[PDB]
Ligand binder design. Structure first.
Ligand SMILES: [Ca+2]
Length: 240
């Protein structure tokens, strides 16, 4: 997250760290949202590689013991059937991870609230992106969970020539684009928490940013619109 602030330890309990094994250690590569005690929602591009992944819930500082972490392996990876690794702009950047075991819920580990199917946020709706992603374009991962205030940019505006044009689809949510704050590598798969009727709900799954950089003016961070996949999500959980 570029231009963010350190999130309070108990602010976003549904946020998880998706890590892959590298040698005798683990490396954070993406974020995700715990949606069931044994299911995590993340971006499909986060699990394209043939890597061994693990999920960490109750995480805050990637480099120090917080005394709240739970580590669990990934049992099954269900990527959306229409996902195409070489066409992120086409959409369908979403995947569900069935965990090897069900995590314990507490102050630091909670299921993320998902919006009702079809829900679209009004322009400039209040949202926060969270994650351990790079703190600067081509920079390095944050040690502590970061959050950045990223108001939404409606589709009409986001799909205009000055912004993302045809690159953005109706199945996506745009947020930010102020040139200072944004998601960045390592935030992918993580949540976009938006305030609706007094309650924060995970409306987006971090998908992509401009190849020009992370925090680029009029190039808001783009997320898979969660409300467009409610049926898909339920279908997967019900049959897996
Ligand atoms: Ca830790």
């Amino acid at each position: 997250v570029v231009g963010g602030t350190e999130a309070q330890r108990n602010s976003w309990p549904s946020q998880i760290s998706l890590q892959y094994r590298s040698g005798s250690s683990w490396a954070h590569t993406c974020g995700g949202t715990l949606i069931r005690q044994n299911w995590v929602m993340t971006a499909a591009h986060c699990v394209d590689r043939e890597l061994t992944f693990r999920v960490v819930v109750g995480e805050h500082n990637l480099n120090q013991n917080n005394g709240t972490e739970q580590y669990v392996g990934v049992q099954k990876i269900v990527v959306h059937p229409y996902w195409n690794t070489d066409d992120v702009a086409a959409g369908y950047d979403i995947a569900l991870l069935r965990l090897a075991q069900s995590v314990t819920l507490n102050s630091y580990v909670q299921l993320g609230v998902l919006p009702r199917a079809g829900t679209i946020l009004r322009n400039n709706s209040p949202c926060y992106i969270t994650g351990w992603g790079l703190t600067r374009t081509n920079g390095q991962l944050a040690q502590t969970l970061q959050q950045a205030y990223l108001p939404t940019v409606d589709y009409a505006i986001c799909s205009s020539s000055s912004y993302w044009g045809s690159t953005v689809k109706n199945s996506m949510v745009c947020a930010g684009g102020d040139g200072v704050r944004s998601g960045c590598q390592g935030d992918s798969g993580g949540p976009l928490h938006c305030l609706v009727n007094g309650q924060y709900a995970v409306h987006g799954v971090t998908s992509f940013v401009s190849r020009l950089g992370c925090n680029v003016t009029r190039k808001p961070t783009v997320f898979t619109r969660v409300s467009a996949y409610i049926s898909w999500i339920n279908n997967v959980i019900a049959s897996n």
